[PDB]
Amino acid sequence: MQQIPGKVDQTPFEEDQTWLLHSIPVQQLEMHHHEKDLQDLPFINHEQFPRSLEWNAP
Amino acid sequence: ERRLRILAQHRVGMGVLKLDADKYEDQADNVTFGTTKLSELLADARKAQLGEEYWPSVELKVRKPSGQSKAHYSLIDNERIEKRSRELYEKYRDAKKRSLFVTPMETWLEVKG
Amino acid sequence: SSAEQRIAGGPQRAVIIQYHHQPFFNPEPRLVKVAFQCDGTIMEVPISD
Amino acid sequence: LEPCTPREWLQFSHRNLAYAYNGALRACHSLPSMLLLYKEMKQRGVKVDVDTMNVLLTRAARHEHIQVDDVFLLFDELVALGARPDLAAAETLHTVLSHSASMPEEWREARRLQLVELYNNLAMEEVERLAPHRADRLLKEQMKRFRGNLQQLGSGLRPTVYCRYLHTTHTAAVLLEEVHNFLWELVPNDHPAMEIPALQLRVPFVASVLRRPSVSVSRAEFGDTDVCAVFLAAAERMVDADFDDQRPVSERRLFLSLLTMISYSGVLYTSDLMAQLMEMVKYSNNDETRDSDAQRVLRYALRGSSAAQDSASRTLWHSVEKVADCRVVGRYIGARNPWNPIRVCFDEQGVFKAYPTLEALNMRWDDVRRLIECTGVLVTPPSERCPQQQKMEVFTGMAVYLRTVATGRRYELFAEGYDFDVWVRLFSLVQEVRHDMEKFMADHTLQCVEPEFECWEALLVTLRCALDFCVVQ
Amino acid sequence: MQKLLSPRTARHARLFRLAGKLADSGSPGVPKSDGERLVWVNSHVRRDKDISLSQEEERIRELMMPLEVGENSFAANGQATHGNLFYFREYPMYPGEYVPAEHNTLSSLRD
Amino acid sequence: RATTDAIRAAWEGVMREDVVRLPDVTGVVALYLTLVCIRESGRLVPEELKELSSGLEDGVRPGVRKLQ
Amino acid sequence: TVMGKPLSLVLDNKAWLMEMVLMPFDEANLDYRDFDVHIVSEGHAMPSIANEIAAFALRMAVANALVKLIPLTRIPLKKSGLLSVDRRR
Amino acid sequence: VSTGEFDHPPFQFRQRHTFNTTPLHDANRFGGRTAYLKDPRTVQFNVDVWCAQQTLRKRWKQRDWEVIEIPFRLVPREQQRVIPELYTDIPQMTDPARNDFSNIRNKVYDREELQGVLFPAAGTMLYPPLQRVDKQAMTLDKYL
Amino acid sequence: YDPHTSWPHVEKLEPWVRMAEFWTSTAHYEFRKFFRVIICKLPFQSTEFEKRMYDIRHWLHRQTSCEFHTIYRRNVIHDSAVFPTEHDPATPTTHEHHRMFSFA
Amino acid sequence: EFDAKGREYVQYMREFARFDPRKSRGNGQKGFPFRDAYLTKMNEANQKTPPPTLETIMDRAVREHHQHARILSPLEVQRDVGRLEPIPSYAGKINADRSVFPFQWKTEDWYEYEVAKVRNRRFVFENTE
Amino acid sequence: KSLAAMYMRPPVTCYTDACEAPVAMWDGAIPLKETRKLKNGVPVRTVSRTYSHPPQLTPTQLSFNDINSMYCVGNDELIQFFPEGLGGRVFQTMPPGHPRGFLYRKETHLLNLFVDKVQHWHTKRSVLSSLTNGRTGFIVDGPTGCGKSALMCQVVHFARSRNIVTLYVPDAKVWTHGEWCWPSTILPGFFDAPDAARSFLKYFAVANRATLTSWKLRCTPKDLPTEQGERQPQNLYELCEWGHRAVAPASIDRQSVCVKFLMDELSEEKKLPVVIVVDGWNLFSHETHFRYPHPDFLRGLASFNESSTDIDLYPQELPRIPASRLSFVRGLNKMILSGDDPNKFFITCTTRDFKPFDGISGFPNVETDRFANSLDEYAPYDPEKDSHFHPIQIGNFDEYEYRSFLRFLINSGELAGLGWGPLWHASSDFERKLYKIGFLSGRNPQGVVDHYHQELVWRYDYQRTRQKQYLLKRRMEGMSRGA
Amino acid sequence: DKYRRVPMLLKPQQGGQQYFNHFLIRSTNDRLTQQDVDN
Amino acid sequence: GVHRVGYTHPSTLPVPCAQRWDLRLARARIFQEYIEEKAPGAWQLEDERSM
């Protein structure tokens, strides 16, 4: 990972207790993704055209 | 080639530099956009021909100092540390006549208010 | 040894020793075991050549 | 039936069709009828088994208008196809041959030789099959059957089969019984023999019938080589394995029984068998009998055959293969016990009558050197059967002899109560042996002779004992 | 007293001689020092002694072996509920197994 | 120190093709190539074929499996 | 080796799972040391296959490979039922 | 291969603390971090985040080297080549010519080997020369 | 289906399958659409062949559709004049110049 | 003949036998070698094939020499007790090397192989000379 | 067959012979043979065990011919020579009442002879230097469960039976990965592990009472703090006793002084051969999981909202304290790197008991986790580069060692009465067990032990079923014939 | 039935097929031994 | 391990070489890559479920 030089930063931790006790919120509302939103849900999954999932763009 | 491969992170694979131009709604626009981007990438890559300063550095996973080197961490300032310890034992012995439990913060470690 | 890939030569007369017609015995590119008249050397030549 | 659906394709198989075709062949009643079925078997890809061979051979030999040439040709075609010959088919062909006398004698002898080879192959393969199951009794009975079947043809079971079977044996009773049976099969049933007590067996005299050149001469031309090789196989099997018996039999008794067998057979001995016999007595754990065993075996080795008659053949054999070579003499020096009141060497065909201390040990060592000289094996020219490396056994045996006087034990306190002068003479002996080793190595360096680990270690042990003597002094 | 290194029996000596022959032949995987060769030979003869021990152990256990539901022996194999569910054949299955034909029958056919 | 970067890069460019098809050349140049390659084959072929050999290539490649 | 790792590590050092993989050799009267095998998984990939159904599949694959290597091994294996396929989902 | 649990247990009823079962969301499953816990999808996503955290921490503790960027000239011959970026070409072997078949990307160089290029200003060997044992010397291991 | 035997060759492509489960007591019904790719590799650009290939959709089979993928070699110039190589400026760019909404 | 998987893996092995990273340029997933063999070659621990155990050598030599009965291969022993087949040409002729078979590899190298194979799907230069 | 009643116990001579159990337990597990002798009558019957326990021999009595053989050590000798314990998993096989077995490998013989020379080193100095290539000792490396800990235990046994000063450090994690770390009272910038230090001092003193009692302290202040009634220490044994025998927390600061002076005096000594054996030298080589305290805890604070400190808000990761900064390891390194001390021999071994990680990792369920007490150290280790000792590579058992070890395990467990016993007929024979366990373990020692235990679970062994079927059929047909 | 899907060869799941030949050969050997004892 | 990320100008090194942060900024210029300044160095998680 290339961090902006001169910026104070912390390398990923090596202990389980650090990750456990550190303040990371848990996901509570619905999940959002920058491109899986057009495809509404896993059970809905809107598709544009019936192209093969193996289809390759040249 | 090194500089161009570094600048084209995932755009290069198995010896082929590939660029998917889809910015515009027309393939006639995307051909021009891709041509411009290829020319810019090539021009920036050719900076490696100006001088060595433009040759990208190689990333070598340099090991941490080995155990043999780490051993000398115990011997750095060996004589001075021995002198200090022999001097400090006197202070420890004197302090033991006043407190049941002597403390490094009392002997050498600096814990202030 | 300095060639990045095969080098083709002139078409010489030769005789076929064998030819594995099975795809699993000739993965792409296909090869043919052929013996050349000059020097009697046997080589696996690409089918295209 | 031709398989049409995949369910029948899951059941179709050529080797399994062999079963149905064997059944139809057995059901058939006429050889001419079985011929069409067998022709169709061959036209199809049906794998020809051993049951088809048995059936065709039997129903053909019992057919009337057959020819023995065609019976044997059908057997040849079956074996050329993937058919395994069996004892039953071998017996059928054997009876057919023995009853076929109208054919030319050349053909009859050729087919007799073929059938001899067939019996030998069957015996070999069955020995191999029954080896792992530890079925010594069943294997012995099967070997009885094969031996009886070869007797009619005259030629007996061959020494290679006998050697493998003996190396595979598991108990002394059958090992000795099979050596005995080989000796008796090598001779006619009315041949004279010597009875061996405690075994209730008779060893026949076989050198009377063994082949001899009768006249350069080759070592392989003498038939004694195969018999001595089977004896060597028995000795090797004895050494390299443990027997299990409801009543265990002793090592010394078994070794003496084998010695008596070879002695009464009275066959010319070989360096290999003599050295193998001597190894056991050298490494024997009994002290008050190993000297007697060693002198007995050395007497046998020097005599050559221990045979009463035909002294010219023993001289010829000695000129041929040099019995009692360096390996045997080195093992003899290693086996002979120091301070034993028996003569170490032989004088003018010495029966080793007896000895009349520091001077006693000096006499023993000088007699050992005289024995080495009289055997004169250090002059023998190196050969391909025996390279120079064997010659190191003499120095190894001498070093072990010195070790045995250094310590009162042998492969079982630092040392005993001796004289300081005795230990000085022992140190001198160690030094002179060390230096004769140097002369030997310098002489034969052109093949890079190498000392034995026992030879090197015995000197170290003798020096350790001498040093302990010095320390206690 | 110091124990002597050399082979202590004829079988030991013969195995050491074979090991030396193999080393001279230079087949892969063989050692080159006599001490490790002697270690190899000693371990092999000890293994043979152990194998003979196992043979005698099994032959004694064959006669000590239980066959009735008793103390620490019991038919949890459904023989009481289901019965004899395991097959057991006394004939060699032709292609795989082999047992020599009986000599009474051999002689009968030959005669 | 042998040849300039231009010639070197030209050489890799020539040899880097998918298939390095050899060029057709004039007769005089073909004669020159034949003669110079005859001169050079001696330096490459082993001593046992430096004079007599059943072919110009004989000895150039060691592993060539012949027929007989 | 199952998918590039030793069996004792793939099946998490569980005796009751690896003995199924051994079974085709024993039923065939064969030494497992005379053969070296590699098992590749084309099914649903999972971090750990240390279970009885996966062991069953591995045993069946080994048995089929042994059958095709040496046909006469098919006799004891089919009789033992290592060639038979369960149909349970 | 990993024997740790990756999925969250399903909820089809209220469990109890029994011989073969334990209460859902107890302080035993994921190191006691289930005290933060609804929807199986979001719960599984949180468990996936925790598992990724564990993977990362162990993957970083396994890392004993450092990635100093060295100029091309002051570099070993094996690294004086063109190295494709990750996931761009086939895993590259260091040098098949010298029988070195090993992922070049995973090569690690001992710090007491580049003191000639690192720390060129310090004329004293900050790290003493690496002691290498002699293989061609009779030692206790080679004595038997 | 073999490139070695015929020209052009047909290669298979995985059918697009979309299963849907809905109330009826539930039912599973899936839409399916099967594909086949015809590949023609020519050692030259023939606009006549491109025309005759494009004209296929007019007599395509009933209720069957087609789409065309073209991969052709094209010459591209790198004009070093409009795109030159220059020394890296005296004051180099920092991360502020590549900030959010910096592209505009 | 061969079954589907046998044919598939025979083709894989032939491809790897004629594989070349230089000839695998400008190509998609078809340029990646036979994963298992390639990673086994790359793994260093497999670059050292242990020699036969001292016990194996001792037993083989004892049966070869002290007993005049060579040890036969499992492919060379005759199993059909009623038929005699011809020994295959490959019976005991295939040397055992750990760098060729069986396939052992490092987990990170396998991960990189898989990710690169799935990501270089469309990095193919279809039109070539 | 009931030859059990006819069996009479042999005469007890050693703890191993005392480990024998009632005949009812091992009747059939160890079948009894019968030997007929002709003593004062042609018929006699001596029912004896087919298998006897491996001999209980001293390291002096062990010989070259014993290579790849199993011997035993009496419980009294074990307690005498190992007060600190048996690091690693070696005591896994020695429950109460079990014989304390030990394999004698080629490496074990080499080490025994090397310690024999160390017993009189000053004369054999050239031999020792040639053996170690001049390095100050050996380090033993190899795969997991390979036998490094067992070899170090055997080395300590050899040295302490030969009466040489031995510093045995089992489970070097007790020192590096200890419970809590404390800065050294008298060494500035150096840290302690007081619990491990006090335990080590107790066990070392009790182990080496004789030589330590005969010892005379050379460089040690004799004004050491002392409570009423206790005599000032005059020998190294009394120094260790003063260090480790004290009331808490007065022991925490006393142990640091004791260990510092003990290390100084051991470094000074130049006449007695001192063997230092440590299990897991890589731990003492690279680092300890303890970190340096945050400087806020040292600087001091008045109120929390004043300084805006985040010590109780966010955890951090201070640099890990390297193992070189401990006082015990400081003494060891001082003695190691500093030449002019050909008196101490470091026979160390590495460890590989780290938790596993193979690309992905979830959470190991607590109840089913055989790596619960494994080390969180996934970094690689190379003994040659990470230490000054001469590396010795061990591998898995070869068939000879494996056969001997499994024979001892199974037969002695059953004889002592902890195996199948009356249920021996439920388990396959020794040859099948050997073949299967060899397959399952790859002849790895730890794997062999684990699968010997797991053999309780085998479900695809039909040998005994078929044997019972065949013998029952044979008996039934015999009875039918008899009828 | 609950286990209708499993094969009949797996219902009892016979095992130990490698011992039958050994048992046949040992029975024949013991028969020969008994005959010899009788004689 | 809390730290401050560093940077060496090509001029300062004994032999200059194009730095990786410079290459990163060149890539950002060419491809208009927005670089989030507050991206944490500790939070580098990969979705193992897919990778």
Ligand SMILES: Nc1nc2c(ncn2[C@@H]2O[C@H](COP(=O)(O)OP(=O)(O)OP(=O)(O)O)[C@@H](O)[C@H]2O)c(=O)[nH]1
């Ligand atoms: N009695 C005895 N047990 C041994 C011997 N070698 C290995 N073991 C067994 O192996 C088990 C594991 O101990 P080691 O192999 O020494 O463990 P290690 O060598 O320190 O390797 P790690 O576990 O990775 O630290 C012990 O429980 C022993 O029972 C041996 O020579 N004698």
Ligand SMILES: [Mg+2]
């Ligand atoms: Mg350990």
